[PDB]
Design a protein around this ligand. Structure first.
Ligand code: CLR
Ligand code: CLR
Ligand code: CLR
Ligand code: CLR
Ligand code: CLR
Ligand code: CLR
Ligand code: FM9
Ligand code: FM9
Ligand code: OLC
Ligand code: OLC
Ligand code: OLA
Lengths: 366, 360
């Protein structure tokens, strides 16, 4: 029985605490190794319907591989004579029991796909991905047409890729926390927005520099210059997010905010959110400055007025996200809607007018 | 404890079998009602992580609502004096335990999204839906262009609609059996293929009729109406079967040790719509072969002919694979996506290339 195998495991760890000889550790470790392997070959009833080679069933067994591996490390020091170092390894076994195996042994709550809020979020993302791919295809098909050629094409592609990845974020956020889902959400949430606003601050800054009324040919105006500038700004976020993923490796952890419920969530720190959020905020603030400066520019069917109201909305979304995310226990769904709403604003305000002039009024397109 | 509540439930049902008085039934029913309500308020360990208002948790409690409701029906007949009719209600309670609750109490096997075969199937369907929506958009954008206008646009929309729906089928088939998923797969598997082969049998019949004063039923409306009547035969056939054989998730016992959660779809529920689709494919192939060397519309008829020979082989292979092996869900999944993929691939890839790669 797996319920009694976990009892032998816990009671033998207590023997290490009150150990006053080498024989009281070696016996309690060998007995613990056999009790851990007996629990590994078992299946918890919440995984009884799952395939023996399902990701959860693989992760369940892997938790015991770490644990049995740690028992081998403790028996190495004990058989050597260094029983003092083997005694300290007992506390390392307790932390393993919580971070890899406990989630499979106690009732753990987490955000399901079944929840109305996550059904709305994923339904909205499917529409988002569909409309984004629709927009992208029209942009690609009407490549050489004067409506799309006149704007920064390569930069609009980065914006669309950022918007697309923005709609992918809820799938990684609503998915039951796994090392992979925790990795991807940190990467995708940080970079999706950074891609949009890195290309947008490049686009709007270029528009602000264009605002000038013999002369000299202006630099960093080229399509390649724009892509390079945007790429350096995105790479700042990529460096920031990846460095944090390295020093704070993504993991599913058990949170205890409620007195009765145990919640399975990602181990993402405040720093893991504030550092990339602050950089996205820096881009959104830079964007809005240039968007406002050029709000009344009538060039490209009042393209600038649409960027301006995209930016005022994004500012409000960002400003609302900080107290909602840091002041409430709705962190997953808040992130979901902050990303999906901010990217919908951009897709809607910035691309719907262009689509209209292309797929509904092609006489004004020429 | 829910494990001991199910013990009281089973042992009191045994008392009804060996009952030789009205007192031995009334006591065993009241004791069973209290034991059922005690099990309903509980949570099985495979649902311990689930929200109390999750679909599984709701369906778990609903199984006891039927069961407690049945105990009320049996106590109605027992208190009346008709203990003979109340005794028969004990066998009706055993089925309720099986068809609605047992799946949450015993380890049950079913096809999960985690399986490599269903990962491939869903990955292939996502590409399918994407390519289908890509094709549809090009068809819609290049509406008035001579390549798409010369054809039956409205019928191609039916073909693509059926093809799209063909790729939607694996999502309903791989999803853990629920009443909804069982309804949707019967509807979608039957109608997806019927949409494709009704619009195609109409298209190819026309091509074959052209092979020869003004000919009738040649119009864009006539084609859509003819296709719609043929689809409605499948819709009538599938819905009538859904009515006389309501879709439900049930526990199958093909393996001596493994219990499977599957949809209660009968051989008839598969053979009747499969046979009609087979009739449509056979009719299609007849006309496709008859007009295999027609050079009109960039050898349009050649692509249909090959599409039809492949679809015949897929259908002919589906019957012994589906009826002769325990790979019924994944077989349906690939029979539908593969047959739809030949149509999308063979018939629409050249149409794209002659629009988006070779604009004359
Ligand atoms: C283009 C837009 C409008 C389509 C959106 C995609 C739709 C079809 C998807 C996205 C989210 C989906 C839901 C995801 C979660 C659940 C919970 C599950 O237990 C039952 C099905 C249900 C309720 C899904 C049904 C289909 C759904 C509504
Ligand atoms: C045309 C486009 C919009 C349709 C494609 C929808 C994509 C986003 C869907 C289709 C099938 C989906 C997967 C189906 C199975 C699972 C199992 C669950 O444990 C985690 C989510 C995961 C991994 C899903 C995530 C989203 C998914 C990849
Ligand atoms: C019309 C098309 C393009 C819509 C997009 C694809 C649909 C079918 C996808 C998108 C997201 C998907 C869902 C995402 C994740 C899960 C969780 C898993 O535990 C059960 C299936 C379920 C609920 C998926 C079923 C299929 C799904 C609803
Ligand atoms: C072209 C479009 C339709 C493809 C987009 C597919 C997206 C939605 C895919 C690509 C990789 C995917 C993820 C791969 C890994 C995991 C970890 C797993 O434990 C839960 C699901 C999750 C988080 C997946 C969900 C869906 C996902 C984010
Ligand atoms: C590129 C085109 C063909 C679209 C492909 C969509 C891809 C990205 C989707 C479709 C189905 C998906 C898978 C559905 C189920 C699972 C099981 C889950 O526990 C881990 C992720 C994994 C393995 C998903 C990864 C992403 C996936 C492979
Ligand atoms: C908008 C139109 C044209 C496309 C149809 C949308 C499709 C993709 C949606 C709508 C309703 C959906 C289903 C609703 C119910 C269930 C039952 C559940 O056990 C898992 C998912 C499953 C099987 C869904 C899968 C996706 C689904 C079939
Ligand atoms: C644990 C999970 C649930 N939470 C997260 C969140 C983040 C994260 C990183 S950056 C960001 N930004 C900028 C916005 O959400 C944002 C962007 C633009 C706006 F207009 C409004 C808001 N969010 N990273 C990791 N984990
Ligand atoms: C129990 C579950 C798993 N199986 C099903 C199957 C059906 C069903 C209805 S019609 C059909 N056809 C025609 C094909 O599958 C078909 C179509 C074209 C081909 F080339 C080959 C085969 N299948 N309906 C409900 N449930
Ligand atoms: C902008 C970067 C934000 C960095 C500030 C992070 C503040 C925080 O919450 O982290 C704890 C802090 O690093 C103390 O050890
Ligand atoms: C119209 C032709 C119908 C073709 C469908 C033939 C199905 C064969 C069949 O009825 O299957 C028997 C199986 O052994 C039962 O389990
Ligand atoms: C044609 C459609 C079938 C494609 C479906 C994909 C895999 C099906 C594999 C089933 C093999 C039958 C097993 C027979 C046997 O075990 O002897």
């Amino acid at each position: 029985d797996l319920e009694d195998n976990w009892e032998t495991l816990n009671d033998n760890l207590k023997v290490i605490e009150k150990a006053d000889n080498a024989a009281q550790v070696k016996d309690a470790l060998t007995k613990m190794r056999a009790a851990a392997l007996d629990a590994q070959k078992a299946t918890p009833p919440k995984l009884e319907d799952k395939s023996p080679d399902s990701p959860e069933m693989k992760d369940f067994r892997h938790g015991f591989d770490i644990l049995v591996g740690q028992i081998d490390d403790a028996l190495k020091l004990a058989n050597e004579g260094k029983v003092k170092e083997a005694q300290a390894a007992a506390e390392q076994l307790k932390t393993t029991r919580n971070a890899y195996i406990q989630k499979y042994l106690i009732p753990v709550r987490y955000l399901e796909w079944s929840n109305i809020e996550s059904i709305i979020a994923i339904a909205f993302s499917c529409l988002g991905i569909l409309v984004t791919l629709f927009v992208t295809l029209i942009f690609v098909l009407y490549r050489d047409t004067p409506v799309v050629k006149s704007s920064s094409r390569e930069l609009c592609y980065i914006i669309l890729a950022g918007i697309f990845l923005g709609y992918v974020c809820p799938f990684t956020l609503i998915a039951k926390p796994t090392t992979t889902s925790c990795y991807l959400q940190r990467l995708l949430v940080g970079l999706s927005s950074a891609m949009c606003y890195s290309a947008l601050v490049t686009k709007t800054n270029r528009i602000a520099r264009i605002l000038a009324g013999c002369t000299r040919k202006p630099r960093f105006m080229s399509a390649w210059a724009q892509v390079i500038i945007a790429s350096i700004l995105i790479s700042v976020q990529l460096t920031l997010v990846v460095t944090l993923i390295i020093m704070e490796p993504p993991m599913p952890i058990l949170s205890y905010p409620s007195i009765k419920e145990v919640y399975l969530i990602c181990n993402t720190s405040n720093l893991g959110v504030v550092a990339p959020l602050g950089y996205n905020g820096l881009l959104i603030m830079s964007c809005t400055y240039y968007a406002f400066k050029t709000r009344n520019v009538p060039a490209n069917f009042n393209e600038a007025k649409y960027i301006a109201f995209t930016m005022y909305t994004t500012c409000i979304i960002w400003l609302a996200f900080v107290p909602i995310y840091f002041g409430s226990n709705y962190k997953i769904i808040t992130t979901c809607f902050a990303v999906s709403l901010s990217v919908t604003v951009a897709l809607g305000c910035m691309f719907t007018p262009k689509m209209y002039i292309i797929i509904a009024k092609p006489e004004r397109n020429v």
